[PDB]
Coordinates of all heavy atoms in Angstrom, one line a residue:
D1 N 29.9 38.7 20.1 CA 30.2 37.6 19.2 C 29.4 37.6 17.9 O 29.9 37.4 16.8 CB 30.1 36.2 19.9 CG 31.1 36.0 21.0 OD1 32.1 36.8 21.1 OD2 30.9 35.0 21.7
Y2 N 28.1 37.9 18.1 CA 27.2 38.0 16.9 C 27.7 39.0 15.9 O 27.8 38.7 14.7 CB 25.8 38.3 17.3 CG 24.9 38.7 16.2 CD1 24.3 37.6 15.4 CD2 24.6 40.0 15.8 CE1 23.5 37.9 14.4 CE2 23.8 40.3 14.7 CZ 23.2 39.3 14.0 OH 22.4 39.6 12.9
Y3 N 28.0 40.2 16.3 CA 28.4 41.3 15.4 C 29.7 41.0 14.8 O 29.9 41.2 13.6 CB 28.4 42.6 16.1 CG 27.0 43.3 16.1 CD1 26.3 43.4 17.3 CD2 26.4 43.8 15.0 CE1 25.0 44.0 17.3 CE2 25.2 44.3 14.9 CZ 24.5 44.5 16.1 OH 23.2 45.0 16.1
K4 N 30.7 40.4 15.5 CA 32.0 40.0 15.0 C 31.9 38.9 14.0 O 32.4 39.0 12.9 CB 32.9 39.7 16.1 CG 34.3 39.3 15.7 CD 35.3 39.2 16.9 CE 36.7 38.9 16.5 NZ 36.9 37.6 15.9
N5 N 31.2 37.8 14.4 CA 31.2 36.6 13.6 C 30.3 36.7 12.4 O 30.6 36.2 11.3 CB 30.9 35.4 14.4 CG 31.9 35.1 15.5 OD1 33.0 35.6 15.5 ND2 31.4 34.4 16.6
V6 N 29.1 37.3 12.6 CA 28.1 37.4 11.5 C 28.3 38.6 10.6 O 28.1 38.4 9.4 CB 26.7 37.4 12.1 CG1 25.7 37.5 11.0 CG2 26.5 36.1 13.0
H7 N 28.7 39.7 11.1 CA 28.8 40.9 10.3 C 30.2 41.5 10.2 O 30.4 42.6 9.6 CB 27.8 42.0 10.9 CG 26.4 41.5 10.9 ND1 25.7 41.3 9.7 CD2 25.6 41.3 11.9 CE1 24.5 40.9 10.0 NE2 24.4 40.9 11.4
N8 N 31.2 40.8 10.8 CA 32.6 41.3 10.8 C 32.7 42.7 11.4 O 33.4 43.6 10.9 CB 33.2 41.2 9.4 CG 34.7 41.5 9.4 OD1 35.4 40.9 10.2 ND2 35.2 42.4 8.5
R9 N 31.9 43.0 12.4 CA 31.9 44.3 13.1 C 32.5 44.1 14.5 O 32.1 43.2 15.3 CB 30.5 44.9 13.2 CG 30.6 46.3 13.7 CD 29.2 47.0 14.0 NE 29.5 48.4 14.4 CZ 29.6 49.4 13.5 NH1 29.6 49.1 12.2 NH2 29.9 50.6 13.9
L10 N 33.5 44.9 14.8 CA 34.3 44.8 16.1 C 33.7 45.8 17.1 O 34.0 47.0 17.0 CB 35.7 45.1 15.8 CG 36.4 44.0 14.9 CD1 37.8 44.4 14.6 CD2 36.3 42.7 15.5
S11 N 32.9 45.3 18.0 CA 32.1 46.1 18.9 C 31.2 47.1 18.2 O 31.0 47.1 17.0 CB 33.1 46.8 19.9 OG 32.3 47.4 21.0
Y12 N 30.6 48.0 19.0 CA 29.6 48.9 18.4 C 30.1 50.0 17.6 O 29.4 50.5 16.7 CB 28.7 49.5 19.6 CG 29.4 50.2 20.7 CD1 29.7 51.6 20.5 CD2 29.8 49.6 21.8 CE1 30.4 52.3 21.5 CE2 30.4 50.3 22.9 CZ 30.7 51.6 22.7 OH 31.4 52.3 23.7
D13 N 31.4 50.4 17.8 CA 32.0 51.5 17.0 C 32.8 50.9 15.8 O 33.4 51.7 15.1 CB 32.8 52.4 17.9 CG 34.1 51.7 18.3 OD1 34.2 50.4 18.3 OD2 35.0 52.4 18.7
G14 N 32.9 49.6 15.7 CA 33.7 49.0 14.6 C 35.1 49.0 14.9 O 35.9 48.5 14.1
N15 N 35.6 49.5 16.1 CA 37.0 49.5 16.4 C 37.2 49.0 17.8 O 38.1 49.4 18.6 CB 37.6 50.9 16.3 CG 39.1 50.9 16.3 OD1 39.8 50.0 15.8 ND2 39.7 51.9 17.0
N16 N 36.3 48.0 18.2 CA 36.5 47.3 19.5 C 36.4 48.2 20.7 O 37.1 48.0 21.7 CB 37.8 46.5 19.5 CG 37.7 45.1 18.9 OD1 36.6 44.5 19.0 ND2 38.7 44.6 18.4
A17 N 35.5 49.2 20.7 CA 35.2 50.0 21.9 C 34.8 49.1 23.1 O 34.2 48.0 22.9 CB 34.1 51.0 21.7
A18 N 35.2 49.5 24.3 CA 34.9 48.8 25.5 C 33.3 48.8 25.7 O 32.7 49.9 25.4 CB 35.5 49.4 26.7
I19 N 32.8 47.7 26.0 CA 31.3 47.6 26.2 C 31.1 47.6 27.7 O 31.5 46.7 28.5 CB 30.7 46.3 25.6 CG1 30.9 46.4 24.1 CG2 29.3 46.1 26.0 CD1 30.7 45.1 23.4
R20 N 30.3 48.6 28.2 CA 30.1 48.8 29.6 C 28.6 48.7 29.9 O 27.8 49.3 29.2 CB 30.7 50.2 30.1 CG 32.2 50.3 29.8 CD 32.8 51.5 30.4 NE 34.1 51.8 29.8 CZ 35.3 51.3 30.2 NH1 35.4 50.4 31.2 NH2 36.4 51.6 29.5
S21 N 28.3 48.0 31.0 CA 26.9 47.8 31.5 C 26.8 48.1 33.0 O 27.7 47.7 33.7 CB 26.4 46.4 31.2 OG 26.6 46.1 29.8
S22 N 25.8 48.7 33.4 CA 25.5 48.8 34.8 C 24.1 48.1 35.1 O 23.2 48.3 34.4 CB 25.3 50.3 35.3 OG 26.5 51.0 35.1
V23 N 24.1 47.3 36.2 CA 22.9 46.7 36.7 C 22.6 47.2 38.1 O 23.4 47.9 38.7 CB 23.0 45.1 36.7 CG1 23.4 44.7 35.3 CG2 24.0 44.6 37.7
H24 N 21.4 46.8 38.6 CA 20.9 47.3 39.8 C 20.7 48.8 39.8 O 21.0 49.5 40.7 CB 21.7 46.9 41.0 CG 21.7 45.4 41.3 ND1 20.5 44.7 41.5 CD2 22.7 44.5 41.4 CE1 20.8 43.4 41.7 NE2 22.1 43.3 41.6
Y25 N 20.3 49.3 38.6 CA 20.0 50.7 38.4 C 18.7 51.1 39.1 O 17.6 50.5 38.8 CB 19.9 51.0 36.9 CG 19.6 52.5 36.6 CD1 20.6 53.5 36.7 CD2 18.3 52.9 36.2 CE1 20.3 54.8 36.4 CE2 18.1 54.2 36.0 CZ 19.1 55.1 36.0 OH 18.8 56.5 35.7
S26 N 18.8 52.1 40.0 CA 17.6 52.6 40.8 C 16.9 51.5 41.6 O 17.4 50.4 41.9 CB 16.7 53.3 39.8 OG 15.7 54.0 40.6
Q27 N 15.6 51.7 41.9 CA 14.8 50.8 42.6 C 13.5 50.6 41.9 O 12.9 51.5 41.4 CB 14.5 51.3 44.1 CG 15.7 51.5 45.0 CD 15.2 51.9 46.4 OE1 14.2 51.5 46.8 NE2 16.1 52.7 47.1
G28 N 13.1 49.3 41.7 CA 11.9 49.0 41.0 C 11.8 49.5 39.6 O 10.7 49.7 39.1
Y29 N 13.0 49.7 39.0 CA 13.0 50.3 37.7 C 12.6 49.3 36.6 O 13.4 48.3 36.4 CB 14.4 50.9 37.4 CG 14.4 51.8 36.2 CD1 13.8 53.0 36.1 CD2 15.2 51.4 35.1 CE1 13.9 53.8 35.0 CE2 15.2 52.2 34.0 CZ 14.6 53.4 33.9 OH 14.7 54.2 32.8
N30 N 11.5 49.6 35.9 CA 11.0 48.7 34.9 C 11.5 49.0 33.5 O 10.7 49.1 32.5 CB 9.5 48.7 34.9 CG 8.8 48.0 36.1 OD1 9.2 46.9 36.4 ND2 7.9 48.6 36.7
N31 N 12.8 49.2 33.3 CA 13.3 49.5 32.0 C 14.8 49.2 31.9 O 15.5 48.9 32.9 CB 13.0 50.9 31.6 CG 12.6 51.0 30.1 OD1 13.0 50.2 29.3 ND2 11.8 52.1 29.8

């Protein structure tokens, strides 16, 4: 929402690329 509303940028590639995130990566991972 920030990039679209403030900078008129559609996702990170400017053409609405899918945004993918993984959580619970590894064990005790501090990063």
